Design a protein around this ligand. Structure first.
Ligand code: 0O2
Ligand code: MG
Lengths: 418, 418
């Protein structure tokens, strides 16, 4: 029996399946309780069960395989694995493990792994000789990630506008400056769709911190891939835990020669959660924040890199400014010159209901010549020269108007070449 | 007899009933005590006493059927339900149980439930199979709640202004930012009347926290619905208990595919009560608040959603700003991004005796395309474009002057189009 099959099924179908098996009252308790009871009954039946999850090390030394469909939330059905297994097969937090599951015997409040048959989509033995994450050297991004949809639809307009504004490559550490009511989500959704279509091989995971519960559903419906989020109901501990699990899973994927892309929703929310969770170091920085608090956001953000051996790790993050909270621009002043590429959004442009509201003159990337070719580089340079004089809002209007008349980016290339 | 109808009777009628029943004193006791005495005297002869109430589950195992007449205050007349009944029918806190009761026996001082005949306005068997609230899928609000009644009276001006400014829908999570002496109570009263008029099907509850005793009675005599309040002369535990009972009752009602609307007089007062009642976690933010504390009010605020299966939970809570306290400031600080609808009251417009004192430029709703039609949305955009250059007080004066001339918002749009 497949645990993920039960998890993916709707709750009503789970209740009906349990009632067919029996168990009497099943509707009232949560989904995790339902799946736990159904799994226990099926194990009592005798048939072997196969389950998969993402491993995590707890402070007690034990391992837990959290599930992605629950946004890595601890639950009664969370498989728990002894440190003996971790010693037997070299494992750490973020690893994806699939195998047969032991029924919960006396003293077993959760399910446990009997035999492991898959580690990070690979055999257990082949995971021992892999190299850690930052043992691999950091290298400048060189392989361009093309996120032009190419269908000519209105959705592709923002993708190509950001592409000529500031190209994004594999392994880059992007940064988005998003004032309130600027279209941050309407940009993230398009970026996620472009990544999922143009580059299906790369693993796409979306991390949302301090989000509204209603937006999580639309994010997880629109994005083809893995969406994990922590709403504002959950404490800062949950935000930190989900962020750490996501970054560790990405690092483990990179170590396994996989290419993974992370679309972080907000650096500011993560930094606030980290400031809340960490103990005080005895020194209070400006704005009621801790020096040690700001370190772990840097640890999360700096993992974006183009590994010369196994692939890339791209982390696109968005910054919140002019929110009113002073810790927000404290975090901004911490990350002034950290991102490889920076895209700036403008509130005044968004006021006229013309989108995308970006500042083309400000938005740009460093060492762009590596990602693009010579012709693209000089074309971008002359475009910067010619749209440099006119105002940013008129610049955006002219850009969207001109890209509208052109089917693709090459049509624009030939248009400004004449 | 029925306990609820006895509770609804005035105190003098209760004393007369106790006297003609042949019971002495009953004058200087509280309402609950005289109710208990009357119930005991009638129970000595039987006649199958009835009673209903909202279930509050205590950690010891058993529960109590509180009444909304006393705003769920603990009293001698509360029905006592044993854990056996809570186990036979799956009952959680907030369930509305109605049935016959039995007189207390030797060794017990509370009336006990004898035979349940209604749970959540439904048969117990049907209520046992309901899906839990947490398993329901949140969604963006799409069904509008039109405040305007079209009467043309000067009271409808506030409703029409608010319909133009920040449209609301079933399942919204609204926030009213009100400085002191701006007119929040009158606005809440008007919203309650508009809801009771236009949408009689929705369940309307008005929750007042730390309110003055006279305002409580004013709201109870004005609002056509359920009003539960806890005055300032009560411990913060009382505020916490009342808020939790209200939210649990709302969740149970929503589980039955019902639309529930909750108007919260102050999220700031609720946050203060939670901060007082919660144990200190050792990390204290600016102003003396505990980061652990604000997790509980947020869970109250985050329950507002539009359930995909059916029903919705609208929560319109007022936030107090510029009250002269840093703790209230940080409480509002932690709550900006949670709401999908905001309405900003202005003291500058209030001091000129121009009402409603609504800051039109700084107030709005998120994703208004779903609630309103295309023509309504474009007309609203035209009006916003017209208003935007004006100052807040001039804009509100002009808007109210133009709005009073006609009767309905549609005719106002037609006139402005010309
Ligand atoms: N059709 C279209 N709309 C765009 C586009 N780009 C931006 N927008 C609009 O910009 C708004 C999105 O802003 P968000 O980033 O979602 O809001 P933020 O709070 O900054 O981030 P968050 O969603 O919390 O993570 C939406 O309008 P609101 O009604 O929510 O703003 P309004 O609320 O003023 O009515 C979008 O419709 C685009 O390319 N096409
Ligand atoms: Mg956001």
């Amino acid at each position: 029996m497949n645990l993920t099959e039960l998890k993916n099924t709707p709750v009503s179908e789970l209740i009906t399946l349990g009632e067919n098996m029996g168990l009497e009252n099943l509707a009232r308790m949560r989904k995790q309780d339902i799946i736990f009871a159904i799994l226990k009954q099926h194990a009592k039946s005798g048939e072997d069960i196969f389950g998969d999850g993402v491993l995590e090390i707890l402070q007690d030394g034990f391992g837990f395989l959290r599930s992605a469909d629950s946004s890595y939330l601890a639950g009664p059905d969370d498989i728990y694995v002894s440190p003996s297994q971790i010693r037997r097969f070299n494992l750490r937090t973020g690893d994806t493990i699939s195998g047969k599951i032991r029924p919960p015997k006396e003293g077993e409040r959760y399910f446990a792994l009997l035999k492991v048959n898959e580690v990070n989509f690979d055999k257990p033995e082949n995971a021992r000789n892999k190299i850690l994450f930052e043992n691999l050297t950091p290298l400048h991004a060189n392989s361009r990630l093309r996120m032009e949809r190419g269908n000519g639809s209105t959705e592709d307009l923002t993708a190509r506008v950001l592409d000529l504004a500031s190209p994004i490559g594999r392994g880059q550490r992007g940064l988005i400056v998003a004032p309130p009511k600027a279209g941050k989500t309407m940009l993230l959704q398009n970026i996620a769709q472009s990544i999922a279509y143009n580059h299906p091989d790369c693993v796409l995971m979306v991390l949302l911190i301090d989000e509204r519960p209603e937006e999580v559903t639309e994010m997880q419906r629109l994005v083809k891939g893995e969406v994990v989020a922590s709403t504002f109901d959950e404490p800062a501990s949950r935000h930190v835990q989900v962020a750490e699990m996501v970054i560790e899973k990405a690092k483990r994927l990179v170590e396994h020669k996989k290419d993974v892309i992370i679309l972080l929703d907000s650096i500011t929310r993560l930094a606030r959660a980290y400031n809340t969770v960490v103990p005080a170091s005895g020194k209070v920085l400006t704005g009621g924040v801790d020096a040690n608090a700001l370190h772990r956001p840097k640890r999360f953000f700096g993992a974006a890199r183009n590994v010369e051996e196994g692939g890339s790790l791209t982390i696109i993050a968005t910054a919140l400014i002019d929110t009113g909270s002073k810790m927000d621009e404290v975090i901004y002043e911490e990350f002034k010159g950290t991102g490889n590429m920076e895209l700036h959004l403008s509130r005044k442009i968004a006021e006229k209901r013309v989108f995308p509201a970006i500042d083309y003159n400000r938005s740009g990337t460093r060492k762009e010549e590596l990602l693009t070719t010579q012709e693209e580089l000089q074309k971008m340079w002359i475009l910067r020269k010619i749209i440099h004089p006119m105002g940013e809002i008129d610049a955006m209007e002219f850009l969207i108007n001109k890209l509208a008349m052109t089917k693709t980016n090459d049509d624009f290339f030939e248009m400004m070449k004449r």
